[PDB]
PDB file of C-alpha atoms (C1' of nucleotides) in Angstrom:
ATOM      1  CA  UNK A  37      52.758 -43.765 -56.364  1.00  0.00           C
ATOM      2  CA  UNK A  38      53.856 -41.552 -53.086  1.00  0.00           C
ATOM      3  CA  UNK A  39      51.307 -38.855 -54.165  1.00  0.00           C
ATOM      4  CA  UNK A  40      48.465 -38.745 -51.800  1.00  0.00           C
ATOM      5  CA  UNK A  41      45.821 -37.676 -53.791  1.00  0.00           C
ATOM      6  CA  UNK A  42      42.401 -39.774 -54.538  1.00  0.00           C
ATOM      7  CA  UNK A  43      42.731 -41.603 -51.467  1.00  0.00           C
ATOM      8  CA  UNK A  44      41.712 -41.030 -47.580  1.00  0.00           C
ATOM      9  CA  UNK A  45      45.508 -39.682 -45.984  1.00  0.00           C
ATOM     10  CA  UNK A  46      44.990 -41.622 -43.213  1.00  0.00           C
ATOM     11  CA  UNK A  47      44.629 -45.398 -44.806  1.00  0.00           C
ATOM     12  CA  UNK A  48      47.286 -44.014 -46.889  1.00  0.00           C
ATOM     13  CA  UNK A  49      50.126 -43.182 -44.353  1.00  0.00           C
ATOM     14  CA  UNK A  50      48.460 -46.384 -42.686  1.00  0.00           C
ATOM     15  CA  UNK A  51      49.499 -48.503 -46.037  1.00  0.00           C
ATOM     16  CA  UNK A  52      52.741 -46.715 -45.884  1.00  0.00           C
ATOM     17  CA  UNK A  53      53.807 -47.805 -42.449  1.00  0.00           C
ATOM     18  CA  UNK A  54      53.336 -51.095 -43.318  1.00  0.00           C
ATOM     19  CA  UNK A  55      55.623 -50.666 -46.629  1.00  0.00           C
ATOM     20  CA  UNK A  56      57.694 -48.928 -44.383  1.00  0.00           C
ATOM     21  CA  UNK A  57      58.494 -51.563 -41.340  1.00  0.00           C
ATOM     22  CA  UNK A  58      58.569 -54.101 -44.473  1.00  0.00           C
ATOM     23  CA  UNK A  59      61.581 -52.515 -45.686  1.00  0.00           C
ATOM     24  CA  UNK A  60      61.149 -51.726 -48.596  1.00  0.00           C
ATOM     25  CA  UNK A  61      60.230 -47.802 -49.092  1.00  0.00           C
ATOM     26  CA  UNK A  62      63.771 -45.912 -48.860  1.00  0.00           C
ATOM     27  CA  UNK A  63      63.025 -44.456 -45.313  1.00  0.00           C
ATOM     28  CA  UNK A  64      63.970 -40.791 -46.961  1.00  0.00           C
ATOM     29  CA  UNK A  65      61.493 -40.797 -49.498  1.00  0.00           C
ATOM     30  CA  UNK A  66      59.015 -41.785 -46.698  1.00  0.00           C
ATOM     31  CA  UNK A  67      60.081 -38.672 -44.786  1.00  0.00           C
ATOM     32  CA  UNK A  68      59.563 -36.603 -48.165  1.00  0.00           C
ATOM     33  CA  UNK A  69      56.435 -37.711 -48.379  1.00  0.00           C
ATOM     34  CA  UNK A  70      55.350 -36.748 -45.368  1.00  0.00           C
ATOM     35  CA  UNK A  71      56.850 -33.233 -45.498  1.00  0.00           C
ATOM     36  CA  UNK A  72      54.759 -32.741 -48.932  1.00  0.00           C
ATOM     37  CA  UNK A  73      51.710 -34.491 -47.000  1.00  0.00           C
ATOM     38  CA  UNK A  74      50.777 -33.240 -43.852  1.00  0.00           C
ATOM     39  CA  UNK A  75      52.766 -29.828 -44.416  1.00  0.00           C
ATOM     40  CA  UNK A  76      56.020 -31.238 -41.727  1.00  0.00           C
ATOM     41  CA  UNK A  77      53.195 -31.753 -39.162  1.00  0.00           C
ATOM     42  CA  UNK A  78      54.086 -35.778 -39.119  1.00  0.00           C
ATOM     43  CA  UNK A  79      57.030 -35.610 -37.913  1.00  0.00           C
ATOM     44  CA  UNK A  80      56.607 -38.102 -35.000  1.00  0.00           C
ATOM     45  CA  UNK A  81      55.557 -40.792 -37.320  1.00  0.00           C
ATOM     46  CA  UNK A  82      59.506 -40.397 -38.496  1.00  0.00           C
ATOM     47  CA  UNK A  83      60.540 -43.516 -36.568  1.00  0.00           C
ATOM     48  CA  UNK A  84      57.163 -45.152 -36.439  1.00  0.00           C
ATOM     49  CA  UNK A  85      58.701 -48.780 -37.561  1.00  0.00           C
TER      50      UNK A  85
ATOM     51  C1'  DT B 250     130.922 -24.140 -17.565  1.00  0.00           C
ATOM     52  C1'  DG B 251     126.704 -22.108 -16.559  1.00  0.00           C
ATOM     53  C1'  DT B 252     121.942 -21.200 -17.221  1.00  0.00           C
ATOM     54  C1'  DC B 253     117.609 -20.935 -17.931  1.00  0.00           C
ATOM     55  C1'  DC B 254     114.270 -21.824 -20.211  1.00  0.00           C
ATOM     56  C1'  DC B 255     112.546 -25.684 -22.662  1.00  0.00           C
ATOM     57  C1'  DC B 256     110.982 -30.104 -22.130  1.00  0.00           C
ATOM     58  C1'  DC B 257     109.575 -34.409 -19.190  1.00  0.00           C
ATOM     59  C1'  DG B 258     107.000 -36.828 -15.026  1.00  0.00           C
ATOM     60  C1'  DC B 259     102.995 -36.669 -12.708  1.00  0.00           C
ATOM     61  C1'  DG B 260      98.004 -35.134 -10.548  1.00  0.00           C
ATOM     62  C1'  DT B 261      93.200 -33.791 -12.469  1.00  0.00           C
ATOM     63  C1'  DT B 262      89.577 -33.327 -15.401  1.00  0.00           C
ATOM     64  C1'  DT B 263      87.479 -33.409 -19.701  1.00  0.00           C
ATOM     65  C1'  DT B 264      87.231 -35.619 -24.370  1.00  0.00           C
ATOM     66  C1'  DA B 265      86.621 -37.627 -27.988  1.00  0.00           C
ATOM     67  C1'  DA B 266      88.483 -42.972 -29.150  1.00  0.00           C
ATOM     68  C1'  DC B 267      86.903 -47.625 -29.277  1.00  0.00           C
ATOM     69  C1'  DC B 268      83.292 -50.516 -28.898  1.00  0.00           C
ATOM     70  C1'  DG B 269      77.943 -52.411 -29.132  1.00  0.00           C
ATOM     71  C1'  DC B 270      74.054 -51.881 -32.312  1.00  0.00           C
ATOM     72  C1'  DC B 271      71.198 -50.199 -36.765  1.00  0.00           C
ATOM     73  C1'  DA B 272      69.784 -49.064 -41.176  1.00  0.00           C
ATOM     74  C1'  DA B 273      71.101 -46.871 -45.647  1.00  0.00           C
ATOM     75  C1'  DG B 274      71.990 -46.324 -50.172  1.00  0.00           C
ATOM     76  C1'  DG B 275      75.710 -45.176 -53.085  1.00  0.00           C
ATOM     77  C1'  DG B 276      78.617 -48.478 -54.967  1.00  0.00           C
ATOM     78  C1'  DG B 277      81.915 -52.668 -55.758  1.00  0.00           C
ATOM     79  C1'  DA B 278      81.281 -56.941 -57.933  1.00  0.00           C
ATOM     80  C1'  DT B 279      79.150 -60.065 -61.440  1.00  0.00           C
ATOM     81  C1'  DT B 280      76.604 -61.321 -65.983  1.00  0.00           C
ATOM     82  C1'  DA B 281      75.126 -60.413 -70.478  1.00  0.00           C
ATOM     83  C1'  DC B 282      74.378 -57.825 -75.482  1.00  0.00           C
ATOM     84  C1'  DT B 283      76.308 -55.605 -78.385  1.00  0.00           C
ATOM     85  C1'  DC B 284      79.146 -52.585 -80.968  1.00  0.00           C
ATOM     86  C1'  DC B 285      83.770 -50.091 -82.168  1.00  0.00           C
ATOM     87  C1'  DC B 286      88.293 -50.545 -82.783  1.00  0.00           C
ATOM     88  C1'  DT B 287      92.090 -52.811 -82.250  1.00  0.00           C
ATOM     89  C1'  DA B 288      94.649 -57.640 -83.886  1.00  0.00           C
ATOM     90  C1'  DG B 289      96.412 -58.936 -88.612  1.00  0.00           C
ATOM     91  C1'  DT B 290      97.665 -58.226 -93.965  1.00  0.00           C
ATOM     92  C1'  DC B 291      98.689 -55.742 -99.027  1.00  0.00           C
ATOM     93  C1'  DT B 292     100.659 -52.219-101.080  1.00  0.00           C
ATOM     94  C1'  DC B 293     103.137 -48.073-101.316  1.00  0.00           C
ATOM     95  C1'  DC B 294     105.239 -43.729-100.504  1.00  0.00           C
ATOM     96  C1'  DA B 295     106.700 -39.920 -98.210  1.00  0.00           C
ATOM     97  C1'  DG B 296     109.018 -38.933 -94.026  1.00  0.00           C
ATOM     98  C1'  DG B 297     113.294 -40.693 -91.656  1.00  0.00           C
ATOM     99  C1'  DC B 298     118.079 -42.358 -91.712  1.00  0.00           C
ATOM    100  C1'  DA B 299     123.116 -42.963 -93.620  1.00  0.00           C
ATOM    101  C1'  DC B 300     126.315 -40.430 -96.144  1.00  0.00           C
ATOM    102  C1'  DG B 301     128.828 -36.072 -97.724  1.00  0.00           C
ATOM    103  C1'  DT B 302     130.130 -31.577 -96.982  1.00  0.00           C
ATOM    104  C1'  DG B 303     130.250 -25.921 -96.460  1.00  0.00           C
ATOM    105  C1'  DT B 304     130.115 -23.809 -92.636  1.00  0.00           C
ATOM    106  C1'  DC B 305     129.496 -20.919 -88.114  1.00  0.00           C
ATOM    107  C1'  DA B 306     129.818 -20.964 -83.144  1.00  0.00           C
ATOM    108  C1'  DG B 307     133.104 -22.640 -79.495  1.00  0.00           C
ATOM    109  C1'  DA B 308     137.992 -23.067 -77.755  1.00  0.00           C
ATOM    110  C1'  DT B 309     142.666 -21.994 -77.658  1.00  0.00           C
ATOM    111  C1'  DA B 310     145.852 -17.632 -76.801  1.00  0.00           C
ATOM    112  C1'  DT B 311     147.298 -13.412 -74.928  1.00  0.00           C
ATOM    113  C1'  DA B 312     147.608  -8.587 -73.630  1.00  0.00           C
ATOM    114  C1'  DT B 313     144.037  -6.090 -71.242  1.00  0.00           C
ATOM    115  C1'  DA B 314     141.157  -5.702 -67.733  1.00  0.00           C
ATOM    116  C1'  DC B 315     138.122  -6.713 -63.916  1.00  0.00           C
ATOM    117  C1'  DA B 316     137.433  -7.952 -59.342  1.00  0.00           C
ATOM    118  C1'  DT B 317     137.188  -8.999 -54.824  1.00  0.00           C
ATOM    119  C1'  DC B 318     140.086 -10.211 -51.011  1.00  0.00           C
ATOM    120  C1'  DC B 319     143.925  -9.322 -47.952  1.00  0.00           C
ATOM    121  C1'  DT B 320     146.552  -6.122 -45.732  1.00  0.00           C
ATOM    122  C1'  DG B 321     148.661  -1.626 -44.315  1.00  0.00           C
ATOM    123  C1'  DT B 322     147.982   2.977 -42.739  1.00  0.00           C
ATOM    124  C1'  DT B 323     145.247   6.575 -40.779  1.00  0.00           C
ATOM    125  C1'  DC B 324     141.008   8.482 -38.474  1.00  0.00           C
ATOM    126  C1'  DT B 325     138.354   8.872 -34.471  1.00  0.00           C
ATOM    127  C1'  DA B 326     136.289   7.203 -30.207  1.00  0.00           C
ATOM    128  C1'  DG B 327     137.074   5.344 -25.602  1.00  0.00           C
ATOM    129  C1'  DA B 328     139.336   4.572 -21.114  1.00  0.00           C
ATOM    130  C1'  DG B 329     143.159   5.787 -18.002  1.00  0.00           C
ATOM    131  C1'  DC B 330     146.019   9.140 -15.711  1.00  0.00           C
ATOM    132  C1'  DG B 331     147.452  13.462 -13.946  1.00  0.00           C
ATOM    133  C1'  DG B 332     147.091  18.340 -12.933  1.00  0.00           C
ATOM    134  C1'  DC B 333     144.143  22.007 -11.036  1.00  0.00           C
ATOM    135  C1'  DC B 334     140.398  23.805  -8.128  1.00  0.00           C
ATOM    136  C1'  DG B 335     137.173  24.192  -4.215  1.00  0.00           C
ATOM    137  C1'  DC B 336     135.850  22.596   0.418  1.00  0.00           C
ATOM    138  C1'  DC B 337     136.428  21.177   5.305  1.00  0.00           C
TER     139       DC B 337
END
DNA sequence: TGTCCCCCGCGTTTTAACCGCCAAGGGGATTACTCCCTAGTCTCCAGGCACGTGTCAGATATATACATCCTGTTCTAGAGCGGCCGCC
């Protein structure tokens, strides 16, 4: 359920972030995701937790 | 005994070693279900062991023959000496 389609990306990486600081996402599928999402534009929201 | 060049003691400046802190995510450790194969017999039989023996490669033997090592003699190169020549 990393796939971004269906749904606003913003909420979505929003929702993630929150997964993410709660520790439970595997921080390097979290980075994948954002490579295949915003096309490696996102990469300052790398360390966002 | 000498030497000289190879290694030690020390000054200086980098450098990566150890420590403080942080997550990670493969991975060690534990628990459980189950499934194969190894524990344990019965019977037997065909390979393995004790016995017996003809035999074929190794050892003894000795003149013959290698075979290299030690030594003697000769060849040739090197240093010393002496005679001859030119110069002051």
């Amino acid at each position: 359920g990393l796939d971004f389609v269906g749904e606003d990306a913003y909420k979505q990486v929003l929702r993630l972030s929150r997964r993410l600081i709660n520790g439970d996402l595997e921080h390097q599928w979290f980075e994948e995701s954002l490579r295949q999402a915003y096309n490696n534009k996102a990469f300052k929201l790398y360390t966002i937790d």
